[PDB]
Design a protein around this ligand. Structure first.
Ligand SMILES: CCCCCCCCCCCCCCCCCC(=O)OC[C@H](COP(=O)([O-])OCC(O)COP(=O)([O-])OC[C@@H](COC(=O)CCCCCCCCCCCCCCCCC)OC(=O)CCCCCCCCCCCCCCCCC)OC(=O)CCCCCCCCCCCCCCCCC
Ligand code: BCL
Ligand SMILES: CC[C@H]1c2cc3[nH]c4c(c3C)C(=O)[C@H](C(=O)OC)c4c3nc(cc4[nH]c(cc(n2)[C@@H]1C)c(C(C)=O)c4C)[C@@H](C)[C@@H]3CCC(=O)OC/C=C(\C)CCC[C@H](C)CCC[C@H](C)CCCC(C)C
Ligand SMILES: CCCCCCCCCCCCCCCCCC(=O)OC[C@H](COP(=O)([O-])OCC[N+](C)(C)C)OC(=O)CCCCCCCCCCCCCCCCC
Ligand SMILES: CCCCCCCCCCCCCCCCCC(=O)OC[C@H](COP(=O)([O-])OCC[N+](C)(C)C)OC(=O)CCCCCCCCCCCCCCCCC
Ligand SMILES: CCCCCCCCCCCCCCCCCC(=O)OC[C@H](COP(=O)([O-])OCC[N+](C)(C)C)OC(=O)CCCCCCCCCCCCCCCCC
Ligand SMILES: CCCCCCCCCCCCCCCCCC(=O)OC[C@H](COP(=O)([O-])OCC[N+](C)(C)C)OC(=O)CCCCCCCCCCCCCCCCC
Ligand SMILES: COC(C)(C)C/C=C/C(C)=C/C=C/C(C)=C/C=C/C(C)=C/C=C/C=C(C)/C=C/C=C(\C)CC/C=C(\C)CCC=C(C)C
Ligand SMILES: COC(C)(C)C/C=C/C(C)=C/C=C/C(C)=C/C=C/C(C)=C/C=C/C=C(C)/C=C/C=C(\C)CC/C=C(\C)CCC=C(C)C
Ligand SMILES: COC(C)(C)C/C=C/C(C)=C/C=C/C(C)=C/C=C/C(C)=C/C=C/C=C(C)/C=C/C=C(\C)CC/C=C(\C)CCC=C(C)C
Ligand SMILES: COC(C)(C)C/C=C/C(C)=C/C=C/C(C)=C/C=C/C(C)=C\C=C\C=C(C)\C=C\C=C(/C)CC/C=C(\C)CCC=C(C)C
Ligand SMILES: [Fe+2]
Lengths: 281, 52, 247, 54, 305, 44, 46, 44, 45, 54, 54, 43, 54, 54
């Protein structure tokens, strides 16, 4: 049931809504007010995905797809069999995500730790709402959101990207990709370094943080530190998600053409625009 | 107790008012996005349907 | 090899994907068992071994050789709290909170908890103390921030509780770790640097009211701090967030 | 049959009541949405067709 | 209110020259300058850096690769600095044309210079890998960094060396340019059906998203328990403190299971090496085993027939 | 008596009486509203 | 309904009242939205 | 004799009696609702 | 001996199993009646 | 078979009860959904066809 | 074969019981799904064809 | 090589009950297969 | 070959038994799936042709 | 030649045995799949053609 050290931490407090009501654990899980809300919303969304599979006529989990309303419904309601199930599932998903974040806040303040984790999760919630709520509302139809299918939302990604030609000419998209790649590289390096210090050559003592600093200074001439590497990890992940949200929010709203055509402002700059040579001349 | 009736009503209203504030705040945010998209030239340039 | 199938629709891509599913299941098993080296076996709320322990067996012990002759650590191993817990059950059934019997901040339970870590200071790669007061550190000075030395310290009740006397510095990382605060009675306490906000004219401690500063655990040696003392100080200051909400 | 009251020797009523409320509300919402999905038993469309509202 | 994102007080002392386990100290440099800007976020100290035989080999080869691509770019500009700055991101060293196969007879302008640059890059990358291994060995540490780098090298080798050989043509390889290798990526997806329906492509994307997820979770967790000295994880492994227990209990009460202060780094290293490993496999299978990934998906229950 | 909440028997009875008064008022308002809607636009 | 008042010896009435207010408001909003989506009963449209 | 929740035998009996009263009330309401729906629009 | 991991004695296990089997047989009887009704209404063999 | 009661010496009754309840509910929902997917056992559409309701 | 009982000296009975229950349920579900995929063993469609129900 | 803390008698008794359960399960499965094979043989 | 028993002085029987069980089950499933994928040796389709069930 | 037993003082038998087992199984599976994907050595199809199972 409990970990060897868990008992002294399970104390009555830290709730946002309610009091001793909902202030208990079910197995390992803590279930506050927002635990109840999360469970209800998640279960309803999953059963509605299953019922949409029933209506669709497929039981292959890779072929199940819940499509948004067609463009002719605009931002209004749609019949359940045609677009309404997607809307109810979207509401359930938003409720589940927000209740999960608030439940994390309750757990954080019961344990006395900072609220870094719910904030970081709120970043991902905002990216999801950008794709499913804000961009469809600005573009004026629920039909611009993506469907709930394992391989059909990839079709949404492909169609949306190829509407504007090659999509990785979008500049905020380039920044987001660079952040994602740097994040994966930093995660690999950090995990490898801590493991290499804690698991040295056979028969040796554990290495110290001095050895980690020394290793990176020998390798690349700089060490960011331990606090530094964790700050950098949080910031790289959040920056990647923020720039992805930005590059999608500006895509069908401010920009309307090929992004490669966007990159021509630099080439057509007056003081080299007509010099005859190279690629663009 | 009349004070008891008022206290139960106040608790109900506190819960209902917080739920209403959150719901209406979400609606106000949606209206903000709807308005800023109304001021944009989306109508002139409409994207095709991504879902097929 | 384009279109070469051994049976059905099974080609090198299908073979690769199924091999990867098998590999991924094995890798997840390995990662979970490696994570199971602390806190197990699972216990009942009365301390006895729980009936249930889980789908993953406990891993074989491995030993760490600690530096500077500090000994060895073998995990998984017999783990005991080695301190009294002043908590009482609020319910006979499991899954309910345990209420503190006395003052939670003095007793060190809940968000004010601490662990019985080693009673020795943390060392650096060369064997010296990792954390030193900036006065005892040689050549250390404040470089580019607001220097907190001499600033008054304000608690969460907007009342002055003391003044900053020194800064305790992590020598290998070259970062400030603690603020040393002198109280009204001429006694000094350590405050975690991550729990204070250094302003233009003051240092503000949101977690702790002015009267609670005297209750911070003290260090038995003015020149060094051990791991156990660090646990007590950090746990006390953090427990102030929940247990000093009024005033 | 007559000894079913001992289920409260196993489960504290507070968590049981929370779980039962969640389960019953979820089940009722499920069934109502399932009925609303079908062209028959969609009482709103049935009424619209019956009274020629269109 | 203090979130521990930026340091509020910065201190400096004598520079830390580093450990001397059995590193050859004659191959180290002096310490560089301290930077306040970097010290706001992490450490201020720059250097020293170790330079050895493999450092020299990697630097020479990487500099030659960079200079070869740069001189080709200057040639494409017509030696005009204005055109060089205008059409930067548009220049590219291309691999030999498809009709040359794997042969080395392609002219300098039509792909021979690409082969020279590729050889220099090959030497630079492999000598840097050896350097990571040897720097780990000198300090007595495990070689985890070398193996993670080996995963990255696997994907790089498949893209540039292994797959072109199996396909029988250097024209399959990636060109050296900013926009040109993006164009190569897009055309690679278009030629082989739809790379979204490559299952190992999907796994690679799953592990890239998972790296972002796990790194955000872990950075946030360590910053949240940094008030208890949770950033000093190497000591929390040896002597568990309240920081590690609070982090474990947060994740246990949230999602029902937790990690340790070392197991989380095992999760981290595997989550990253897996994106690169699965990506290498997925690229290797494209064109050599599957020519049209969308049709493959239709035949394997992923797309509607 | 279980008494998980600290209420006595009389306190529980009084609280339930007031709660039921409120519930019946809410239900009466809802019934009138449904009657008005059904007269205006029946759904059966 | 003879002894239903004992529910108040199981759950704290303040918390129950607040949670019940939240539930009732959310249910009313759900029903109103379901009505609005239908072409009939859309009182805003008419 | 077996105890996991701290309730005695009499407490469990009384709680179960009230719970069964509530369950039968809920079931009776559901039965009436199903009878009304089946008369209005049978599904067999 | 007991072999018990759960702390139940022999009599406690017997009584708990008796009540559990009563519940199981009630559930099974209801299911059997439901299947009989469905099979009469619309057989699947 | 006369000693099947000792499973309660092996397994804790309340964890088994929770897992069994979840399993039974999910199994029942699965079977009902499977029947609703079949055109010849979707009782709602069977009743729609029988009473000529379109 | 007369000493197969010592596997309970090797393996803890309750972990084996949980794993065995999960394995047996998943195996049964797999076989039933395989049969339902086959047109000649989908008993629902066999009954639909036999009794002429469309 | 106890490995679980069970004695010899405990292992024997547990295995006896386990085999009773296994044979009951197998008998039910055998009857089910006989019914299906009579209804619709697969050989 | 008589003294193959000394393998258990090298390999823990607990790990070997689990690994062997996983291996044997996966191998059996693989071979059965190979046979089902072959138009001959697919016993279900063989019987469907033999008894004119299509 | 007769001193090949000296290898067991350089390699520990556990790692060698595990590595050898994994290697042998993977090699055998790969060879079988190579033969199975070759029309001339696909024994299932050879038997199908020999006995006219089409
Ligand atoms: C076939 C499918 C099914 C297979 C099996 C299925 C059965 C069930 C699953 C079983 C698998 C479970 C895996 C869990 C292992 C746990 C590993 C671990 O983290 O720590 C334990 C252990 C040591 O732990 P430690 O306590 O930290 O030790 C510290 C030491 O004290 C001091 O430190 P140290 O010096 O000892 O080094 C520490 C390091 C030690 O780790 C290593 O030694 C790794 C060695 C390199 C990998 C081998 C391939 C390299 C290319 C071949 C050329 C050289 C061969 C290797 C040379 C060996 C020399 C020693 O340990 C680590 O923790 C490393 C963490 C990250 C490793 C990342 C490895 C990246 C490999 C890049 C691949 C490049 C080519 C790929 C080609 C395509 C392959 C599909 O490390 C290992 O055992 C590493 C395992 C390496 C696995 C390689 C990946 C295999 C990819 C196959 C994918 C599936 C096939 C899909 C396609 C199929 C097509 C048909
Ligand atoms: C139209 C474009 C196509 C497409 C075409 C491709 C192709 C083609 C490839 C990918 C690949 C990848 N794609 Mg894709 N991709 C598309 C859409 C997506 C989407 C999306 C939301 O739509 C996402 C998230 C991704 C994501 C991904 C990554 C998971 C993956 C690359 C792993 C990596 O880190 O590589 C970056 C890391 C490396 C290349 C390793 C580099 C290692 C070497 C050693 C570094 C040496 C440095 C060198 C010496 C320079 C020195 C610098 C100085 C030292 C400073 N793609 C669509 C469908 N994608 C790759 C893959 O693996 O696919 C299976 C790949 O090859
Ligand atoms: C912002 C940086 C990255 C980030 C951060 C992040 N995510 C987080 C956290 C953090 C810090 C958490 O604390 C939280 C967590 O608990 O993680 C274990 C979470 C989480 N990140 C998750 C996943 C996830 N994160 C992703 C991304 C990212 N998360 C970013 C890259 C992605 C993708 C695709 O990129 C996924 C899939 C979950 C594991 C978890 C949130 C769990 C949760 O919300 O649980 C409640 C909801 C359910 C159990 C299910 C609801 C189901 C719906 C009703 C139906 C949905 C259908 C769906 C739309 C179909 C799509 C096809
Ligand atoms: C393949 C999955 C492996 C399943 C094993 C498992 O989940 O263990 C759960 C655990 C495993 O056993 P355990 O948790 O009681 O502990 C094992 C005992 N030691 C450590 C001494 C060996 O069992 C349960 O949690 C009971 C849950 C109820 C399930 C009801 C029947 C199904
Ligand atoms: C890697 C990328 C893919 C991400 C999935 C891996 C993480 C989940 C599986 C890890 C195993 C954790 C575990 O111990 O049991 C499962 C746990 C269940 O909790 P748990 O209580 O069984 O975990 C502790 C088990 N012991 C005590 C033995 C260690 O996972 C969950 O909480 C939910 C189920 C999995 C989520 C769905 C996966 C998608
Ligand atoms: C991390 C996980 C995400 C990464 C996914 C990328 C790889 C997956 C593609 C594998 C593949 O090639 O498939 C065929 C491959 C090879 O094809 P195959 O023909 O040999 O066999 C499978 C073919 N079908 C589906 C027809 C049986 O087979 C498999 O991989 C089967 C094993 C797993 C299949 C993946 C199923 C995921 C869904 C399970 C539960 C989800 C429920 C939710 C659904 C509703 C969503 C809104
Ligand atoms: C399929 C199997 C799923 C495996 C999950 C394992 C469950 C065990 C567990 O959670 O323990 C909780 C715990 C487990 O027992 P425990 O927490 O009291 O402690 C065990 C005792 N020791 C450690 C000594 C062994 O029980 C509870 O928390 C009580 C919660 C109230 C639940 C009321 C009855 C629920 C029965 C099913 C009703 C719901 C059906 C559908 C629900 C929603 C569907 C979408
Ligand atoms: C794809 O395949 C399909 C779906 C088509 C078909 C597959 C079918 C197969 C795979 C499904 C298999 C299902 C399993 C095998 C069914 C098992 C059912 C049994 C396990 C259900 C038993 C339920 C028993 C419950 C109802 C008992 C309840 C008892 C009372 C509620 C409480 C009694 C407990 C007492 C009070 C304990 C306290 C007493 C002590 C003294 C305190
Ligand atoms: C897709 O499949 C579909 C959806 C189509 C069909 C599938 C259907 C199946 C899967 C659904 C299964 C449903 C379940 C099994 C139905 C069960 C219903 C029962 C469990 C409901 C019981 C309700 C009991 C409640 C109403 C009791 C309430 C009592 C309160 C009113 C007062 C109690 C207060 C007492 C206890 C206080 C005691 C304290 C003192 C001190 C004694
Ligand atoms: C693709 O391939 C297809 C699917 C077509 C075909 C593949 C088929 C093959 C791969 C499937 C292989 C399946 C395996 C080999 C089947 C094995 C079945 C056996 C292992 C099931 C045995 C079950 C035994 C259970 C029913 C026993 C239960 C006993 C009672 C429930 C409890 C007894 C325990 C007592 C109480 C312990 C306590 C006593 C002490 C004294 C306290
Ligand atoms: C998707 O499915 C749809 C939504 C279409 C339909 C499904 C509907 C189902 C699933 C929802 C079922 C809802 C039921 C469970 C509603 C229950 C409502 C509760 C029981 C009503 C309680 C009302 C209590 C009132 C607020 C009591 C208030 C107490 C004070 C007012 C006390 C007295 C103080 C005096 C009166 C102040 C004034 C003078
Ligand atoms: Fe870390």
């Amino acid at each position: 049931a409990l970990l060897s050290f868990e008992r002294k931490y399970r104390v009555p407090g830290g709730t946002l809504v309610g009091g001793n009501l909902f202030d208990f654990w079910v197995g390992p899980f803590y279930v506050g007010f927002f635990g109840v809300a999360t469970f209800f919303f998640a279960a309803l969304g999953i059963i509605l995905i299953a019922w949409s599979a029933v209506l669709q006529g497929t039981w292959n989990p890779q072929l199940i797809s819940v499509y948004p309303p067609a463009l002719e419904y605009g931002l209004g309601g749609a019949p359940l069999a045609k677009g309404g199930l997607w809307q109810i599932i979207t509401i359930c998903a938003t409720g589940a995500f927000v209740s999960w974040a608030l439940r994390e806040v309750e757990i954080c303040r019961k344990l006395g730790i900072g609220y870094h984790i719910p904030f970081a999760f709120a970043f991902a919630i905002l990216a999801y709402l950008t794709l499913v709520l804000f961009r469809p509302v600005m573009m004026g139809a629920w039909g611009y959101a993506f469907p709930y299918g394992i391989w059909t939302h990839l079709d949404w990604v492909s169609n949306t990207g190829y509407t504007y030609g090659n999509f990785h000419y979008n500049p905020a998209h380039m920044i987001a990709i660079s952040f994602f790649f740097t994040n994966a590289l930093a995660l690999a390096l950090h995990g490898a370094l801590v493991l290499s210090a804690a698991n040295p050559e056979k028969g040796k003592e554990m290495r110290t943080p001095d050895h980690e600093d020394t290793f990176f200074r020998d390798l690349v001439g700089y060490s960011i530190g331990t606090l530094g590497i964790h700050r950098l990890g949080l910031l790289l992940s959040l920056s990647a998600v923020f720039f992805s949200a930005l590059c999608m929010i500006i895509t069908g709203t401010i920009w309307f053409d090929q992004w490669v055509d966007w990159w021509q402002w630099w080439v057509k700059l007056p003081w080299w625009a007509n010099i005859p040579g190279g690629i663009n001349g | 107790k009349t004070n008891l009736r008022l206290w139960v009503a106040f608790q109900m209203m506190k819960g209902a008012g917080w739920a209403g504030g959150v719901f209406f705040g979400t609606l106000l945010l949606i209206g903000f996005f709807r308005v800023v998209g109304r001021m944009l030239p989306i109508q002139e340039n409409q994207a095709p349907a991504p879902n097929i | 090899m384009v279109g070469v199938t051994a049976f059905g629709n099974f080609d090198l891509a299908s073979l690769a994907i199924y091999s990867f599913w098998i590999f991924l299941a094995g890798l997840i098993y390995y990662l979970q068992t490696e994570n199971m080296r602390e806190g197990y076996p699972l216990e009942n709320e009365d301390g006895t071994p729980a009936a249930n322990q889980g789908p993953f067996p406990l891993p074989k012990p491995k030993t760490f050789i600690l530096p500077h002759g500090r000994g060895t650590l073998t995990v998984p191993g017999p783990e005991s709290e080695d301190r009294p817990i002043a908590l009482a059950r609020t319910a006979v059934s499991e899954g309910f909170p345990h209420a503190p019997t006395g003052d939670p901040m003095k007793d060190g339970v809940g968000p004010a908890s601490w662990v019985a870590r080693r009673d020795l200071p943390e060392l650096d790669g060369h064997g010296h103390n990792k954390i030193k007061p900036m006065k005892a550190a040689a050549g250390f000075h404040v470089s580019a921030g607001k220097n907190p030395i001499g600033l008054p310290v304000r608690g969460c009740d907007l009342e002055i509780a003391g003044k900053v006397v020194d800064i305790w510095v992590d020598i290998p990382e070259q970062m400030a770790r603690f603020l040393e605060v002198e109280l009204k009675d001429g006694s000094t306490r350590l405050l975690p640097m991550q729990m204070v906000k250094v302003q233009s004219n003051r240092v503000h401690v949101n977690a702790l009211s002015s009267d609670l500063f005297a209750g911070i655990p003290t260090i038995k040696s003015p020149t060094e701090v051990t791991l156990l003392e660090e646990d007590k100080i950090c746990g006390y200051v953090a427990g102030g967030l929940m247990y000093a909400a009024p005033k | 049959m007559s000894k079913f009251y001992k289920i409260w020797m196993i489960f504290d009523p507070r968590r049981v009541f929370v779980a039962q409320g969640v389960f019953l509300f979820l089940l009722a919402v499920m069934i109502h949405l399932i009925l609303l999905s079908t062209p028959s038993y969609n009482w709103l469309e049935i009424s619209a067709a019956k009274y020629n509202r269109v | 209110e203090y979130q521990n994102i930026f340091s509020q007080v910065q201190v400096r002392g004598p520079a830390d020259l580093g450990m001397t386990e059995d590193v050859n100290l004659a191959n180290r440099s002096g310490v560089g300058p301290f930077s306040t800007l970097l010290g706001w976020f992490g450490n201020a100290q720059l250097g020293p850096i170790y330079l050895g035989s493999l450092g020299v080999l990697s630097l020479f080869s990487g500099l030659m690769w960079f200079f070869t691509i740069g001189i080709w770019f200057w040639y494409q500009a017509g030696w005009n600095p204005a055109v060089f700055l205008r059409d930067l991101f548009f220049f590219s060293l291309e691999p030999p044309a498809p009709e040359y196969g794997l042969s080395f007879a392609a002219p300098l302008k039509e792909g021979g210079l690409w082969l020279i640059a590729s050889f220099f890059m090959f030497v630079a990358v492999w000598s840097w890998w050896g350097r990571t291994y040897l720097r780990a060995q000198a300090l007595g540490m495990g070689k985890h960094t070398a193996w993670a780098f080996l995963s990255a090298i696997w994907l790089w080798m498949v893209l540039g060396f292994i797959r072109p050989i199996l396909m029988g043509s250097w024209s399959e390889a990636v060109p050296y340019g900013i926009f040109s290798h993006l164009d190569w990526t897009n055309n690679f997806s278009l030629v082989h059906g739809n790379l979204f329906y490559n299952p190992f492509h999907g796994l690679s994307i799953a592990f890239l998203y998972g790296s972002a997820l796990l790194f955000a979770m872990h950075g946030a967790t360590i910053l949240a328990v940094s008030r208890f000295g949770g950033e000093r994880e190497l000591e929390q492994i040896a002597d568990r403190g309240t920081a590690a227990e609070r982090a474990a209990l947060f994740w246990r009460w949230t999602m029902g299971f937790n990690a340790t202060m070392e197991g989380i780094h095992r999760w981290a290293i595997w989550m990253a090496v897996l994106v690169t490993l699965t990506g290498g496999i997925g690229i290797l299978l494209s064109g050599t085993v599957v020519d049209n990934w969308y049709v493959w998906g239709q035949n394997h229950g992923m797309a509607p027939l | 008596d279980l008494g998980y909440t600290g209420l006595t028997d009389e306190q529980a009875q009084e609280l339930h009486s007031v709660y039921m008064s409120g519930l019946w008022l809410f239900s009466a308002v809802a019934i009138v509203a449904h009657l008005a809607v059904y007269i205006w636009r029946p759904w059966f």
